[PDB]
Amino acid sequence: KRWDQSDLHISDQTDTKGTVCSPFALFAVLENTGEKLKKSKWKWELHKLENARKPLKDGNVIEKGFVSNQIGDSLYKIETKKKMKPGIYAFKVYKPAGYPANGSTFEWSEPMRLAKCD
């Protein structure tokens, strides 16, 4: 329940410009600009979206987890382990317990599109 003063922002995600054929794994990279991430849980969900109209709407959660895979001093990655199918997707990352009450309780990635190439 203690907030460790971490502040994670989505910095990048899979670039699906043009035709990216399913299956291809999706990811997001997050930078922590706050204090070191220790015990605060930053939940994430990969949503299969109805569409990419902003602001993004909750869809079907097909994978989930917590931000944990450290790739730099202040940098983390979330990614898929299940086989992807054609559709439109985005990661939704939730503020941890005790996070300040300014702004949203979540952050979405940009939408990512996987084509049907069969």
Numbering used by the authors: 72 to 189
Paper text:
Bacillus subtilis expresses TasA (translocation-dependent antimicrobial spore component) as the major biofilm protein, which aided by TapA (TasA anchoring/assembly protein, YqxM) can convert into stable oligomeric structures to form the biofilm matrix. In summary, TapA consists of an Ig domain in its core and flexible N and C termini. TapA thus functions as a chaperone in analogy to the chaperone-usher pathway since it already has a complete and especially stable V-set Ig fold and has the ability to complement TasA in the process of filament formation by donating its previously unstructured N-terminal strand. Owing to the stability of the TapA Ig domain, it is not able to open a cleft to receive a donor strand, and thus can only be located at the beginning of a filament, acting as filament inducer.
The longer construct was investigated because NMR showed long-range contacts between W74 and the core of the Ig domain. TapA71-190 shows a V-set Ig fold (InterPro code: IPR013106) composed of two antiparallel β-sheets. D71 forms four hydrogen bonds involving residues G169, W74, and R73. W74 and D71 together stabilize the loop between β-strands 8 and 9. The additional hydrogen bonding suggests a higher stability of TapA71-190, which is supported by the TSA data (Tm = 60 °C for TapA71-190 and 46 °C for TapA75-190). Structural integrity is supported by a disulfide bond linking C92 and C188. Intriguingly, the secondary structure pattern of the Ig domain resembles in its core (gray background) that of the TasA filament structure and the proteins of the chaperone-usher pathway. The high melting point of TapA (64 °C), together with the fact that it already consists of a complete Ig fold, explains its inability to be located within a filament.
